[PDB]
């Protein structure tokens, strides 16, 4: 019933960033997150990269629309494009 959201108004990239499973990456230059899933999601097309936040400040809880990618706390399993992730805290520059 409840578990059945939709992933519209969002599309992934084409190229998958060189991000391994179990590393710390900064999502949108906000905070570092542990990558658990990498590839194409189910809620939305395009390339996606699952990342787990250290604290409850993500978006999903591992399950999006019934599909369970990785297992982790709630409000932590945030999903975003691989390119969006980075190996360092950015902000003033995106190059």
Swiss-Prot record:
Residues 39-81 form the CAP-Gly domain. It comes from the Eukaryota. Seems to link microtubules to dendritic lamellar body (DLB), a membranous organelle predominantly present in bulbous dendritic appendages of neurons linked by dendrodendritic gap junctions. May operate in the control of brain-specific organelle translocations. Residues 83-89 have a biased composition (Polar residues). It is linked to CLIP2 is located in the Williams-Beuren syndrome (WBS) critical region. WBS results from a hemizygous deletion of several genes on chromosome 7q11.23, thought to arise as a consequence of unequal crossing over between highly homologous low-copy repeat sequences flanking the deleted region. Haploinsufficiency of CLIP2 may be the cause of certain cardiovascular and musculo-skeletal abnormalities observed in the disease. However, it has been demonstrated that haploinsufficiency of this gene alone is not sufficient to cause any of the cognitive or facial features of WBS. It is found in: Cytoplasm; Cytoplasm, Cytoskeleton. This is CAP-Gly domain-containing linker protein 2. Disulfide bonds: none annotated. Interacts with CLASP1 and CLASP2. Binds preferentially to tyrosinated microtubules, and only marginally to detyrosinated microtubules.
């Amino acid at each position: 019933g409840s578990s059945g959201s939709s992933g519209a108004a969002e599309v992934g990239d084409d190229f998958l960033g060189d991000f391994v499973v179990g590393e710390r990456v900064w999502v949108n230059g906000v905070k570092p997150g542990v990558v658990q899933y990498l590839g194409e999601t189910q809620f939305a097309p395009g390339q996606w990269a699952g990342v787990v936040l250290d604290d409850p400040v993500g978006k999903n809880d591992g399950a999006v629309g019934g599909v369970r990618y990785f297992e982790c706390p709630a409000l932590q399993g945030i999903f975003t494009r691989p390119s969006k992730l980075t190996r360092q805290p950015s902000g003033p520059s995106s190059g």
